[PDB]
């Protein structure tokens, strides 16, 4: 319920945070299940708006 | 000019003031775009709200 309340603009912010976590391998494996659950829920909830965006920088982050 | 937005989700556990409901609405003009708004009357999904302003983002009203 906490994740649904965030507007979309903060979802891009959230997706930048997770990208930053990925470089720090110690944090990634420390909380890997938690990171997965939040990320997948975010993508599913507002998938329609995410795919609509044409930001090239966004496409590289998800990759 | 005033925009029209259809409610797609009635958020819960938002901590809003009594009688005020926080909802998520997608613009009819641009279905992809979404915005979180505050509504005063009884609101359900698939009903359309007339937004006078489309830039303000909803905040919790306590």
């Amino acid at each position: 319920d906490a994740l649904m309340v965030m507007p979309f603009s903060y979802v891009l912010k959230f997706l930048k945070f997770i990208d930053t976590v990925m470089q720090n391998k110690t944090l990634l494996h420390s909380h890997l299940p938690l990171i997965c659950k939040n990320l997948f829920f975010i993508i599913k909830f507002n998938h329609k708006e995410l795919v609509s965006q044409k930001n090239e920088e966004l496409k590289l982050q998800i990759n | 000019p005033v925009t029209l937005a259809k409610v797609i989700k009635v958020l819960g556990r938002t901590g809003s003031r009594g009688g005020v409901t926080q909802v998520r609405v997608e613009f009819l003009e641009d279905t992809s775009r979404t915005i979180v708004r505050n509504v005063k009357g009884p609101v359900r999904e698939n009903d359309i709200l007339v937004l006078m302003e489309s830039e303000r983002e909803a905040r919790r009203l306590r």
């Binding site: 994740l3 649904m4 965030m6 903060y10 | 556990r13 938002t14």
Partner: peptide
Amino acid sequence: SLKAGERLMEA
């Protein structure tokens, strides 16, 4: 006080 989700947005 701030609620879950509201705190996360601040963070």
